[PDB]
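Agenda item 2: HFS complex prediction
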Amino acid sequence: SFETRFEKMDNLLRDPKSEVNSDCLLDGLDALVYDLDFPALRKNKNIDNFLSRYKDTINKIRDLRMKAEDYEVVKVIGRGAFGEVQLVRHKSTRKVYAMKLLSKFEMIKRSDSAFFWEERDIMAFANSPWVVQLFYAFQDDRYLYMVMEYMPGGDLVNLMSNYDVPEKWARFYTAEVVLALDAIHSMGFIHRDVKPDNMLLDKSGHLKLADFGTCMKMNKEGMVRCDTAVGTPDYISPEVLKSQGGDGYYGRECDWWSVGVFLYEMLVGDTPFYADSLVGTYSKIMNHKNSLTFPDDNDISKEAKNLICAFLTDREVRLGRNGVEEIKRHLFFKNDQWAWETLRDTVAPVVPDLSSDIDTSNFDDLEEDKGEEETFPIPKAFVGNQLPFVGFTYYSNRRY
Amino acid sequence: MSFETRFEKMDNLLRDPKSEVNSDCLLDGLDALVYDLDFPALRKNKNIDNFLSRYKDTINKIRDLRMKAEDYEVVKVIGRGAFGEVQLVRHKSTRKVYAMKLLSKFEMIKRSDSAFFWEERDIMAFANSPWVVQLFYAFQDDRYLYMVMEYMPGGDLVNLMSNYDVPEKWARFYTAEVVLALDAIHSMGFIHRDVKPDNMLLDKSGHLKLADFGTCMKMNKEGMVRCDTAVGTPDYISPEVLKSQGGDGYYGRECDWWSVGVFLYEMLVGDTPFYADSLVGTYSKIMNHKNSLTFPDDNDISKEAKNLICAFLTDREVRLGRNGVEEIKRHLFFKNDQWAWETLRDTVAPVVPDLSSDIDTSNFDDLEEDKGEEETFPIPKAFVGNQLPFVGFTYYSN
Ligand SMILES: O=S(=O)(c1cccc2c(O)nccc12)N1CCCNCC1
Ligand SMILES: O=S(=O)(c1cccc2c(O)nccc12)N1CCCNCC1
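Presented output:
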């Protein structure tokens, strides 16, 4: 019909998950103008005329759409790998966010993942109190921008370094991770990189999973076929670490191994497979049968050791192989201050005391500023460097 | 402006027909970028290969759903127009009858002239005037531009003059409808530059409408325009436009009124005032119009008709219509007892066409057939971008 087609086209122009919605189309044009505005390309009449035909148009667009100078940077609160995270206040709305910058040139400089799609998809659609929420995602010719919610309570690395964690706290934080990972699994993902660095606390001190860069979609039988290893040396499971080109076929059990590593560290103060060099940790992980020991200290309850050992074993016998409910039924979690279905409604072990909406006391101080880093080299022929980032924008077509 | 404003102004742009960033225009830029990249030589780059691999499924389904060529059933070819043909079509779904104009993308690019269609698309779609042929739908593919206009079953004025020895009453009517039609085009901010009986079409009631605006240009601050183009058929073209063979001259709207004078002369005499066997002969006679403009030795043409023709066929500086359109209307040639200017298009036309069906193409001569296969593009070894000049041409109506 002449109307069905008009409607079906309109479903593709609106759907927040359409590859051709208003966001993706405004990006597609925006990418082209960027990837053509070079003197060596302006020699072509078509390219030259098109840019001048759209010059006044494309500027009005870039002024109306969400851009970087719409935000007032308060302080940098994290940096490294492919950019930095900074506490920002939206100049217009005065609302406070945590904005993550991703270097386009750096990611294209051999990263082999295009991982940001998974992270953008989860944070924007998870709709879970256990997941850090994405509000806006925009871009330019140099950086990707993820406007997430601010977590003023800081991460779990900061918490463990300032407190000798008692069991009551450990049980709480382990249980919040178990529920958080269960929510991620329900969406159809294996996290593959569970660690205190990725665990952030809100203004009440409740846990949320942040950064889903290593996330991959599970198949029908809930497995992942990956030939190269992914994760962190201390928290990586034996099967993901040895995962070879032979198969590299593992389930969600790898996430529960990392939860056990997380629990061990909270109580002992060290990683279960620590060594002098990085390569030593590796031999100790493969040898978890004989390397996993508890230091002589009478403060780790029987149930704590039981749970850690149930998580820190081979995939075939590992706790959590028979679903999440058997982890919840474990005696370590048996307490009298909360229940699983009402856990995130109870008072947290460490409620943070905040001075203002911009209180960054729980984040270690950094220099900021930098000095505008190097991006893509100026093309001599049409390269199309902005094409792999078309549709990353989450602004015009977002879910409400 | 607030956040709610900056968002909503942007959101309104994607639904605004007059916007260059509207949903249909954005779908073009993506549809175009796929065509101008899907070549094995450019597939070598991963940024390009990864782009096409993702938007593969999407761009096909989009192309099938949007208004395409096979949505129309061609009834009969009714006109040839340099870059392509005009054909009477019936929309398969709605059964509505239109005149669709095709324009060869390769042919346009081949001989420059690939920007004139913007002026024609903008006028026909937004003019909203009973004197202007209306554009309903404008779509495209990788080869042709498509302009779905209203069908004019009455035919053109070329056909009329060849079948009748036009009397003055008729000439007065048709001249007055052109004057009002061009005045409506000037009011939008345009100089037609190509006023001729080929471009004047009659509706089902036999009333005039200007069709084909492929040479219209936007007037600057002073209401003038610069230009430089190899002129086709100088018969109706003015001295000033002819003396501007290379941007070496600015001219106003008075060049349109000269063409009206040529139009009136032809209706009464039966021939163009500056006709010659060669194209350069016509030009030479137009330049020497001070001495070449003559009248037949039979006083069939009245005093006022001669007065008006001579008033239109003089130098720009003294030409009638320089002081506005109202002095053309006040002329004694138009003095009649059948109609008034403000109610002219409501009166009964001198020739009301008798139509058999909604597809009665009796007022249009049969067209032969090109019998010639159209030239295509060579497979690029780089990025030529032979789709960018046709981005944002797609137009729909509510
Ligand atoms: O992007 S982060 O998740 C991150 C760091 C600091 C504050 C945040 C915050 O407040 N909200 C969301 C994410 C945040 N992060 C931690 C993982 C390691 N790499 C990126 C920095
Ligand atoms: O496009 S045309 O305006 C043209 C020709 C024949 C029928 C039409 C019709 O019915 N409607 C609109 C335009 C039409 N045209 C005449 C001008 C010369 N070149 C293009 C063809």
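Discussion summary: Chain B touches chain A through 40 residues (CB under 8 Å).
Owner for follow-up: CH.
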